[PDB]
Enzyme design. Structure first.
Site, short mmCIF file in Angstrom:
data_model
loop_
_atom_site.label_atom_id
_atom_site.label_comp_id
_atom_site.label_asym_id
_atom_site.label_seq_id
_atom_site.Cartn_x
_atom_site.Cartn_y
_atom_site.Cartn_z
CG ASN C 375 4.03 11.99 2.97
OD1 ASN C 375 4.85 11.22 2.48
ND2 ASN C 375 2.73 11.77 2.92
CB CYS C 377 1.55 8.59 3.52
SG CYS C 377 0.00 9.10 4.28
CD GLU C 379 2.49 10.23 -0.44
OE1 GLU C 379 2.45 9.72 0.70
OE2 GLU C 379 1.86 11.25 -0.75
CB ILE C 579 -10.39 7.17 -2.21
CG1 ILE C 579 -8.88 6.94 -2.22
CG2 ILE C 579 -10.75 8.47 -1.50
CD1 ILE C 579 -8.06 8.19 -2.48
#
Ligand SMILES: Nc1ncnc2c1ncn2[C@@H]1O[C@H](COP(=O)(O)OP(=O)(O)OP(=O)(O)O)[C@@H](O)[C@H]1O
Ligand SMILES: Nc1ncnc2c1ncn2[C@@H]1O[C@H](COP(=O)(O)OP(=O)(O)OP(=O)(O)O)[C@@H](O)[C@H]1O
Ligand SMILES: Cc1cn([C@H]2C[C@H](O)[C@@H](COP(=O)(O)OP(=O)(O)OP(=O)(O)O)O2)c(=O)[nH]c1=O
Ligand SMILES: [Mg+2]
Ligand SMILES: [Mg+2]
Ligand SMILES: [Mn+2]
Ligand SMILES: [Mn+2]
Ligand SMILES: [Mn+2]
Ligand SMILES: [Mn+2]
Lengths: 289, 683, 683, 289
Positions: C375, C377, C379, C579
């Site tokens: 993807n 990112c 992962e 987050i």
């Protein structure tokens, strides 16, 4: 029509010697024969000596006599590249490949060399002959400058490009390629400034300036052939170097808005691998017919 | 250097102070006796040639299977019986370099001019030997020339599409934008020039579902389309060419124009996508009165009224838009916008100018839709309905995307043969066949519009060649009289052929009943005004041919009312760039750019004199740049009054004249009824 | 300067040679006494608040209608009973600037932390008040954190999709390329990061319909995708983010990589398109032995074998490709290519590195497909099947496009509550609910794979924070022992919850029977190797929690054999960008980059110390750049042995180390079983 | 003992105005009074004129007369900065903040402003009076250049610094700080060259050279006072700027090896607040662990 565009291209090509690490060239330098090392040294010294004239005299003298703030700025930038970047780059290459005593001797030899001196002094002579407020003498010097930038350097550039295209002396070859890329744009720019002067002349004066340019080219070319044999016969390359000189002579002529002088030839593949309308407001009653 | 190249260059070497035009002829002979005949591939007979071209995937076998080999042999013999000779070196060179079929390695020539014409005629006839011979006689006489896609690709297995231009309507949605990008890539893959109407897309700073100042405007879609056309570039052979059209009342109209400014930043500049501007009469009225105008946000107008801004008449809704507080708008100076248009056209030749009201005041299919934009050459002006491309797994509402087949009459050859009627009818039949055999599986709106509208484009070439070779100045009133009569004849016979096809097939184009053809309004000026030549010289030029009168037009109107028309659109005058060389004709109805053009091919240079150029007609071949653009506008308007679609009208400007002169020419074109303006080429 | 900002900047002011960390707490109080409470909209009761939020199109009616108002009030009361306080100013600032619901005018705060947590819990439970209270206790204890899409958008009407990682397979066709562009635009519109596999696309200089040197390669597709991602930028809120993955044996791999060089021209460089390179074990073997490698033309391989180059195992196919004369290939130096990768990562951090065989030797769903790319990112590592998007009015063959569901465990909060099992199972249930409630109507393969695979990504964060607050160095063997045990328990309880959901619903993921879960191979290393802590300190850390043994793993294997597994993929460790601030946690399982980070918001400066940072644990909070990258690789491999998908693994390099050091880290990662390498951040 | 370190410092300070995005100043500019905008435009225009002549004339002419390839390389680089970087940056600022007519008007204003013409006349006159191999004429021009670098620019620099220090026009201010950083090192370098020539003289000759330097400074100073009042009275800052130029006059004298001439004063504290990776090849041992 062109100075701001050349300004952009010049400043975006800015580079410094320190960016290329030179030490790894010693891994191929040690494997060259004496004649190859000798030719390389002599060619390098030739380029160094000619480029120094361009930095100390050629570019600054043209910047002095050309009118226009933006042109003077571009020309200043080019002079800076000669003195601050190119000259340091040539010195760096030398210091990497030869010991101090060898460098001093090569420069002594090339300084006394008949063919290098002939061309160096011919070019410098035209720079020294520029007269204040005389655009004809300025044009002649610009022709000399274009011939140096776009033609005379190339009997020298041949060899580093030849090695570079073979995977030899890659670090110094990268440096030479950056230098050559600067000289190419210098030649094109000065060429446009010369054409501007040329286009302001009468038809008879134009024909006279064309004869000057071709005559000068012929003198330099015949000396280049001798220079070439003197350096390249010992490594068997002179035939191919001569083709490269003529090809670059044609580019120099095209920079000056002139027709090519020499027939088209193919170049050594190893060296190739190395290489506004007037705005007028609507006045009304233009909508009625 | 080749011998024919030297012979062609011998034209400019003057002998006794005159150009050696005859040397050109010698060049062609050399070009054939030294290159073409040696590089051609000869077979024992036509059977071996056809078999070799069929099995080696050069020709489609389906169109050849409709004829017995005797019929194909007869067609080829008819083609070769004319003993056609190229009168200029450049005609043969252009044919054998751009249109003659070569081998896979392009080392030999498989198709002669007669072979190509025979194959195109056999494809056109669709199994009719007599019709194939008629097409052969029409093309070998060079009375009619199929467009470059049709002429080059007819009957070929490795062919593209025969349609030259495609026009797409882009709805204001991400799904529609992505579908438009996909269809543009698909049609550029097919080789056709794609034009997209971006006037429905909401401007920059509009809301995408209640979050404001979110849209990128038409400039982002322009960048997407530019990259799409760059990617789909005919497999790297011809650069992908696209056109974007925006209404001048769109808020993004400035940014749109800023895509073509030479000082534009890379994030805004678009370089492979031509731009066109659609100017309603309201904008010209506002500029004339010097009253500050308002450009509008399309999405606010759509929210308030339920229709797109370009979907309704600005001449009647502009005041309602301005007085409506729920409609968002920006103040502009219409005269400053006109000056910006003139400056942009001087600098780069863009934008294309489409006078929307000039198009729609004589548009015969306003009931289907008003013409909101033009094609890449700004000569196709047809009704289009936007498509609603919905989400995946949802049915799409397929609209009408314009697409027409091009074909040009050679005016000199048509009038020399005194065959306006026969040539027009045969060309209409060929264009109808090209439309019928066109089926595009990746453009649904284009396919539906081709099936329903049945629109064709029948152009004309060699207007200036015919006028200069007959001693008529292109700017003279006699030339405009000839154009009026000739194109009235062309329109009459095109309408007659369309009605005859509708009668023989029992079907008209979709929504014909609401058209001005069905109501008889279209024929009004033809049943009250006589278009016979007013000058004796033009009447003599038209001798031997029955010029239709008001009675013939009344009979044709009754015939159309009884039977209808098969084609929604019939006549459109394309630029006809490179195929005019093969026909030895001047490009389109435009005046010649230069008497002798010097073109560089390879390392050699060639000189092409204008067809029929000589000492006696040197000054009748007046260069376009030396001509008064107002009289060229008069000529184009005279032709346009008989053409249902537009004419690719290139403006030819001198460097001395200002942007005010360009604006005056544009405003005179708008005043004279010019529908579209193609290019502003400056000498 | 506001008072809370002064109190935050007072941290750097050293008192008695120590940072005033406690002052940060005071800042939070100020940030709530001066700003948050003043700008927070208050209602007389929760009923009025819910009515106002629903009526003003802030919330969705559907998820709130599943509960009686008493149950919603009880859930909100459970959320507020914790009396949660943000321990640092940056936590509250990030929540109330990024995640707290604000009015349409963005000047008032409608949602507190407890309100947002209650809404997300009510959305998760889907009508179960007790389950909603369990979710509220999970999130208010900050044991589990839904990803930024889920946390921000759950229960909101004006929202994007809850999934933001999308992986697309692009087939070698113009229709498939256009569909990929469209789907990328639609998913970026939804707010998701889109990764596209370009290995199936044929290289530059390939044939299109048997015409040579026609393909533009993957670089033109990258330009198209970059334009599409620039256009689709979340309605002008965030910069459109996309990733392109190419196999290293694709011939375009250099040009691919050349898109990230600074010296690249404007027609070569893509600026908003991240790039990743998939490196099979064959390339590493060729570089290791210094044998010259071959980059292959994908279309020639497809023509010869009927399958794409990236669809077959290059380890067994490379010799056959090289020895096949009908497969076109170019000679390259694999060591030079590795050095180019290292240099490019030093300059810009690109490309992402995917070790294909490291992913696929532990991939449980190789029968469905081998993991060909990752993807944005780097992962997400899942099986994907390419789709055959045909022409219009023709049925498409819809494949599988990866879209996993993100959510992160807070390792510190989870382990201090001794609730690994409960947190993992509740997070799995929430991820399953969000995956089931995701319905994308413009990405057919994404929707089909979401329905079939039911793949979720359960990540972890605050690993370095937990280790530093417990006196454990990130590079210590004790830290790796803890990571091994903790993530083995996470995997155990994730598999148990997946099997329990499969048993309850009676359904597994599509093609589960061919997976290694069904055959029991996946549990091999779990039924033979004991993953209990080898250090007494880690065992005392795990005190109070049952650590699954080999017998427990055998029981879980039998349970999976009997009942199946609901999720094809369960665990993936995402970077967890913002987050981690709200949760007062270190980002992902990565080591901290800085002990105290300096940020500039508006014209003000702010200081965020790492969570729990003090004088006692200052040394244990070692910065990532100062760490040995080999030991970081060892820890990431230790975690990866218990993660079915990949881990976002960013390399942290000093400016002193050269490309040889970067290549050594990459090769040690390949040797240690690292699946993906995310970024090369140079200090 | 110093040229190499100045060479390195100059080349490491290389920059282009395009590196700084200027659209961020749009609002703080819009918010200034008409008087403030007028003074700001005129101030930068005065600076543009000085850099135009320093780049076109001053630095190239000094480069021509100073011996040594490295000294010439530094001076050539400084010349390039003056006209290719500094003078051009002001146009970047103008083109962002002001409409074309206001830009046209301010350049017309420099041509007719008597103080700006006087200072250009005086400085350029001294540059053009340099005689080959005449060290005294060269010294006089170097004093003029130091006074331009370290004194004359400062009546102009005050205002961008004054705004920068209040958090206003900070992008333009960033450009100005880069220009100022360059001029500071240019003034020191030229100062050191001037001192070299001065130190060769007899005590009697030195006494005359100090007289020349002080007389020239006073003449330039008196003109700068009138220029300062003309520009700053409308914004209320003339007295403050005067203190600043006296401060910098002392720095110019110090760059020339002379004692400060003006007494120390408190300067506005606002203005004081206004102030590839290395590549190794992969060994066969890096693939095994
Ligand atoms: N201008 C031309 N256009 C087309 N084809 C030409 C042209 N000139 C020569 N050719 C071709 O080359 C051949 C050479 O023959 P040429 O024209 O010299 O006369 P020929 O041998 O007497 O026969 P004929 O004219 O009857 O074909 C022609 O038969 C024709 O096929
Ligand atoms: N660190 C913090 N994190 C989150 N909210 C906070 C924080 N500090 C203050 N608040 C908010 O401000 C309110 C005031 O809290 P304060 O520290 O004054 O005392 P309290 O006893 O918690 O007050 P209250 O009567 O509001 O419960 C809290 O109830 C809470 O809503
Ligand atoms: C998604 C998106 C749309 N747009 C613009 C281009 C389209 O013409 C326009 C319409 O997009 P739509 O696809 O119609 O978006 P929407 O249907 O969700 O919003 P609405 O209900 O208001 O129609 O938005 C952008 O400029 N950038 C984007 O990223
Ligand atoms: Mg919509
Ligand atoms: Mg295909
Ligand atoms: Mn040089
Ligand atoms: Mn040069
Ligand atoms: Mn300066
Ligand atoms: Mn200076």
């Amino acid at each position: 029509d062109f100075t701001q565009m050349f300004y952009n291209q010049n400043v975006k090509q800015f580079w410094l010697p320190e960016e290329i690490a030179l030490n790894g060239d010693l891994l191929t330098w040690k494997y060259l024969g004496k004649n190859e090392q000798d030719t390389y040294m002599k060619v390098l010294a030739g380029l160094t000596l000619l480029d120094t004239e361009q930095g100390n005299t050629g570019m600054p003298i043209v910047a002095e006599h050309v009118d226009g703030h933006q042109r003077k700025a571009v020309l200043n930038f080019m002079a800076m590249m000669e003195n601050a970047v190119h000259a340091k780059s040539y010195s760096n290459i030398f210091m990497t490949l030869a010991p101090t005593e060898t460098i001093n001797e090569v420069f002594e030899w090339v300084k006394q060399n008949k063919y290098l001196q002939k061309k160096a002094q011919m070019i410098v002579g035209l720079y020294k002959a520029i007269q204040k407020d005389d655009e004809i003498s300025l044009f002649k010097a610009m022709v000399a400058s274009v011939y140096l930038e776009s033609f005379l350097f190339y009997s020298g550039f041949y060899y580093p490009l030849y090695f570079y295209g073979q995977g030899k002396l890659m670090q110094s070859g990268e440096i030479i390629n950056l230098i050559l890329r600067d000289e190419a744009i210098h030649g094109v720019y000065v060429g446009l400034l010369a054409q501007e002067i040329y286009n302001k002349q009468t038809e008879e004066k134009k024909a006279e300036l064309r004869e000057f340019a071709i005559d000068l080219l012929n003198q330099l070319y015949e000396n280049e052939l001798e220079y070439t044999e003197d350096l390249y016969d010992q490594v068997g390359l002179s035939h191919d170097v001569k083709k490269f000189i003529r090809y670059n002579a044609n580019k120099a002529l095209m920079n000056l808005g002139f027709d090519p002088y020499f027939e088209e030839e193919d170049i050594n593949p190893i060296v190739l691998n190395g290489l506004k309308a007037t705005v007028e407001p609507l006045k009304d009653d233009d909508f009625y017919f | 250097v080749p011998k024919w190249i030297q012979l062609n260059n011998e034209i400019m070497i003057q002998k006794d102070g005159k150009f050696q035009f005859d040397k050109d002829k010698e060049a062609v002979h050399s070009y054939f006796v030294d290159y073409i005949n040696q590089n051609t591939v000869f077979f024992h007979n036509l059977k071996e040639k056809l078999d070799y071209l069929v099995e080696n995937q050069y020709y489609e076998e389906e169109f050849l299977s409709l004829y017995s080999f005797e019929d194909i042999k007869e067609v080829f013999k008819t083609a070769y019986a004319k003993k056609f000779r190229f009168p200029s070196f450049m005609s043969a060179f252009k044919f054998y370099n751009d249109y003659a079929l070569k081998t896979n390695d392009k080392k030999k020539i498989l198709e002669r001019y007669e072979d190509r014409i025979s194959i195109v005629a056999l494809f056109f006839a669709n199994g009719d030997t007599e019709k194939a011979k008629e097409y052969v006689n029409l093309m070998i006489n060079q009375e009619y020339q199929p467009s470059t896609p049709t002429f080059l690709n007819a009957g070929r297995k490795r062919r593209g599409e025969l349609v030259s231009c495609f026009l797409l309507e882009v709805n204001d949605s991400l799904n529609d934008i992505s579908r438009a990008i996909d269809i543009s890539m698909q049609l550029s893959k097919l080789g056709g020039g794609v034009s997209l109407n971006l006037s429905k897309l909401r401007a920059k700073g509009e809301a995408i579902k209640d979050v404001e100042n979110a849209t990128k405007g038409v400039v982002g879609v322009m960048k997407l389309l530019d990259n799409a056309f760059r990617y789909a570039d005919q497999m790297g052979q011809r650069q992908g060419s696209g056109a974007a059209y925006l209404n001048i009342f769109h808020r993004d109209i400035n940014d749109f124009l800023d895509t073509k400014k030479i000082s534009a930043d890379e994030d805004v500049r678009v370089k492979t996508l031509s731009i066109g501007v659609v100017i309603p009469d309201k904008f010209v009225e506002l500029a004339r009165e010097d009253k500050a105008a308002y450009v509008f946000y399309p999405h606010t107008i759509y929210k308030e009224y339920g229709q797109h801004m370009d979907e309704m008449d600005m001449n009647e809704m502009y005041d309602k838009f301005v007085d409506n507080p729920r409609v968002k708008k920006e103040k502009i100076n219409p005269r400053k916008l006109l000056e910006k248009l003139a400056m942009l056209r001087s600098e780069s030749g863009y934008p294309y100018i489409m006078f929307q009201d000039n198009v729609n005041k004589v548009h015969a299919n306003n009931h289907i839709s008003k013409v909101k934009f033009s094609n890449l050459c700004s000569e196709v002006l047809q009704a289009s309905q936007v498509s609603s491309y919905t989400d995946y797994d949802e049915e799409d509402e397929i609209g009408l995307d314009i697409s027409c087949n091009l074909g040009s009459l050679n005016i000199l050859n048509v009038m020399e043969h005194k065959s306006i009627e026969k040539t027009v009818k045969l060309a209409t039949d060929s264009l109808t066949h090209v439309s019928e055999t066109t089926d595009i599986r990746n453009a649904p709106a284009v396919r539906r519009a081709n099936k329903a509208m049945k629109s064709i484009g029948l152009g004309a070439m060699n207007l200036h060649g015919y006028l200069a070779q007959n001693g008529i100045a292109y700017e003279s009133p006699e030339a405009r009289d000839f154009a009026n009569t000739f194109f009235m004849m062309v329109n009459f016979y095109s309408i007659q052929r369309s009605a005859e096809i509708a009668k023989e097939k029992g079907e008209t184009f979709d929504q014909y009943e609401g058209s001005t053809y069905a109501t008889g309004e279209y024929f009004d000026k033809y049943v009250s005004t006589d278009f016979s030549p007013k000058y004796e010289k033009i009447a003599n030029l038209f001798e031997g041919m029955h010029i239709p009168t008001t009675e013939d037009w009344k009979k044709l109107k009754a015939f159309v009312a009884e039977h209808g028309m098969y084609h929604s659109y019939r006549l459109c005058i394309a630029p006809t760039g490179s195929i005019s060389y093969v026909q030895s004709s001047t490009a389109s109805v435009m005046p010649i750019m230069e008497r002798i053009e010097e073109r560089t091919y390879g390392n050699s240079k060639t000189y092409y004199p204008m067809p029929g150029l000589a000492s006696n007609n040197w000054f009748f071949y007046k260069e376009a740049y030396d001509m008064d653009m107002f009289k060229v506008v008069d000529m184009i308007a005279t032709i346009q009054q008989h053409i249902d679609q537009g004419i690719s009208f290139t403006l030819f400007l001198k460097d001395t004249m200002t942007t005010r002169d360009l604006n005056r020419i544009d405003l005179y074109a708008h005043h004279r009824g010019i529908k579209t303006i193609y290019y502003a080429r400056t000498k």
